[PDB]
Symmetry: C4
């Protein structure tokens, strides 16, 4: 069906008819390259390097021409070229490359004759350094993004409603698949209904906070183990008036876990959604924790999504 967020936590919206998109993106190149697709990004990386090499090699060839350094034109035995062993396009490209990369073999080098060549070399080095820097930065930042970390954090496929501590409550379970920890883990539940004006020329979405609690409805400093979050269906519950029967209703329950990563001090936001159908009644999650002669606690993730009727 239609859903604002994918079960995977991804957006589902398409923005359109934006004016002045191109210029704006060109203003903030950093964010642009970061958000860009991987394929075009690698293309641009390789293109930067090789195309700079190629262009400046063409320029070196032209310079060799103007100075009459080519062999075809028969330079005198006392002709000093602007650049040594550069009498062909290939050689100019190789010089450009060997320079921009700081390899510096030595078979092709500069003479003290043509200053313009020196100035050109300088410009080449400076600009290429700048571009290389910028690209390397974008690449590191695009890898470091924490979105990809959200996958090793998993929400239960199904949320379940049942009596906890005598109170009818809605419950979910969350887990971390890695040894690396989260920090300041907090959960928030949003409710999104469908407000259709008599025919759907437009839609206004109503947000309603849904508080989920663990210990005191406060926070959970660390996500050590698969935890169960629960929200109370009381007189204040915006859910109270919903069709409590399974499958009935037109609403989305979005869930958001925000927490700081320990190894990078970066924030991470996992997201997901539950539909009126996906939610289940009178079911309690199977416990997925148990002791061991280890003296250590163990988490069996096959019991994570498992549930049992009440």
């Amino acid at each position: 069906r239609r859903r604002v967020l994918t079960k995977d936590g991804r957006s589902n919206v398409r923005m359109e008819h934006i004016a002045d998109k191109r210029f704006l993106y060109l203003k903030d190149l950093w964010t642009t390259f970061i958000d860009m697709q991987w394929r075009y990004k690698l293309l641009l990386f390789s293109a930067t390097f090789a195309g700079t090499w190629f262009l400046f090699g063409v320029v070196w060839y032209l310079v060799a021409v103007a100075h009459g350094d080519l062999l075809e034109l028969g330079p005198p035995a006392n002709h000093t070229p602007c650049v040594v062993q550069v009498h062909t396009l290939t050689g100019a490209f190789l010089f450009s490359l060997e320079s921009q990369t700081t390899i510096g073999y030595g078979f092709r080098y500069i003479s003290e004759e043509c200053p313009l060549a020196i100035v050109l070399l300088i410009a080449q080095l400076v600009l290429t350094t700048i571009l290389e820097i910028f690209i390397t930065g974008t690449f590191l930042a695009k890898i470091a993004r924490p979105k990809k970390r959200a996958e090793t954090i998993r929400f239960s496929q199904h949320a379940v409603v049942a009596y906890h501590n005598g109170k009818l409550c809605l419950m979910i379970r969350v887990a971390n698949m890695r040894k690396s920890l989260l920090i300041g883990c907090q959960v928030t539940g949003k409710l999104l209904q469908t407000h259709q004006t008599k025919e759907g020329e437009n839609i206004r979405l109503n947000q309603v906070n849904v508080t989920f609690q663990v210990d005191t409805a406060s926070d959970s400093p660390f996500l050590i183990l698969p935890l169960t979050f629960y929200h109370v269906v009381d007189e204040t519950s915006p859910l109270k008036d919903l069709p409590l029967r399974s499958g009935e209703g037109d609403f989305e329950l979005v869930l958001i876990l925000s927490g700081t990563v320990e190894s990078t001090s970066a924030t991470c936001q996992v997201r997901t959604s539950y539909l009126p159908e996906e939610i289940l009644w009178g079911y309690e999650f199977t416990p997925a924790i148990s002791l061991s002669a280890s003296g250590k606690y163990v988490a069996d993730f096959s019991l994570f999504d498992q549930v049992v009727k009440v």
Copy 2:
């Protein structure tokens, strides 16, 4: 007219008569270079590189002189130079460059004769490495700045007053022009009046928080779509006593959206201002959302700033 903040969210204040500005800036070079203008920054980049090359080349020339390595002075056939193929200023500059860049062609190299030359080379490499590092850092940081990201986030040109849920309220709309998300999005409204002491030798600015709400006056975890923020004009509203008629009054309504970026974990603060004139009465924003056979929701930003009378 006069405004503390530009519609674009930029400051409008000029600090003056600061003592010990220069020395202070010299203490914190990092922040200085980061906040500096782009042109002077590129100038300094190029200058660092080329000028270090040039100075150390001059030094190499002087060394060649003191050792009598120049051709003009007729070194014996058994004269060993401190540096090879360095008998001119140009050659010394080229040596400096080829070294500092780690190119290393080979036509110009060092001999095992003059140690001072070796020590000098060492110093050159170390210092130039340090400077290059510092500049590269400043450059990366100056690009990564999130200010430039604020442009792809847009506030409605006009705020409007009208009855929402039966309550007279002030309303604005906000949107994100990119697919990249924000996080922990919160809004705050400040009111700034004009307190003139009988003649304007001085002015004292009174701040007054204005709370804007969406769902529960709490927060908005993610900025998926163009959202509408609204503040209630009740007995506690500092606006209550203002001249509610359009155009009347001497006050600024500053708006601030604070939120964390998803791809960089950095904070971003968008800002703007509304004047007593810019605010409009009895108008409601045109809905800019609508379904599609996509199964996806769509945002038509041409309807963003659009409004309709009530």
Copy 3:
């Protein structure tokens, strides 16, 4: 005995029976390499470098072969090789190395004859640059991790119960072993009981927040000196009903200090645990602060863990 967290603040849990672990880890390589062990990490570093060198050297050797550049096969006096002075495996490896590192001696270099060689070189440089970048990033990030900073922050070995300001309270002491500061230091106490279903096929852990206070139960902006945190045993204390006698009970008191580092703006979370036995009754911590002719305050950490009966 069994404990969720080690006295050292480390986890004690083993997650098992995870499905699709390998592919997931391969998706997020950044986090993986960061969390990986040091030995395998250095192995991978060295392997990247040397193995890329080795493979591309093998390729260069094969190319030399196909072009008949080897000496063993007797190239004519007018035979131009794709690469110079490359007639052996060793030489090909050396060429690969000298290139990928941008050393560029010069005895072994490229000719303008074989383009395929040029294209191959290009590919080599690009890929190796990318890999080097990625590894360097992971290495920097794995060092910068703040976990290792938690060691220079120390919790008292023993917590003690006694009358403070006439109120029975539980008290602990915390200190920083360095001159570098913390920021936004806040403390939280969790209580973890043992809920065994009649036999231990499963266990459900109940979290209970325990608030610790210093001045107003608010926060402590800076961790200048060894501070004492204390929690009140009142009617609301979840501890109130515990066996207050030393050694009795089956519960863990976990302690968590969260604070921001000043020099890196990164977060840090120190953790520890106290068992019913480790806790002591009617004891007050020895003061570890005292003046000095310095005019400066001094902290004697030998008095840190020291206690005195009341």
Copy 4:
């Protein structure tokens, strides 16, 4: 006199008699090098580079020896050295350098004869790369530290007590000397009294939060202009019972401004202290703001510290 914090916001405490300091510092090298003094840091930088060069050059010399490559020992005309043009200590050092820096002149290079030399070179490159990386990181991080940014933020030299809005309150003023902004600026006031046990073998410091407010006692999103913070001396004021007369009392009023930097998303904490003497009675700060034909507001910082009697 004695003060916990310097007027400049620096600590004044000396920690002593720490056990296992050295090993701990060696565990967390990152933080150590970051917090280290500049002089020793530059020493270590230069030492890393030059000393690695020197040691590996010594090794190359020894290798040349074992292989009998030295001239002094008269190698046959058909003797192939492990390394070319390396017959002296100086030459070995130069080879080490030219390699570790990726310069690669070419007059001194490797032969395909001695593999051990190749393996040694590999080790050298790898280790030196690692060390260079680590040092560069520490250096960048030590510069980027925001402490140094606190200097361009200034607190009023004197705090003053007087009637504001009819209420006796304590007031201070704060300013930013740069165009770069702060974010989430919040202020906290701590009160520190002197608890001497009958003779000063020990001292227990009592913290008491003092709330300072601007608009609603909430926060100040941005530090645009010199702002005045004030705290109310009411029945709840811990100051209420102090000797309100100037100069009387034994207490320190510490002030802490916490805020996020806009250009780096980093936190910054400015600190200062006021003594019972420094505080002044019945004085109000001179306004340091005034209009201009600019249409812009201006801040005259010479009026910052200025005050006027009431």
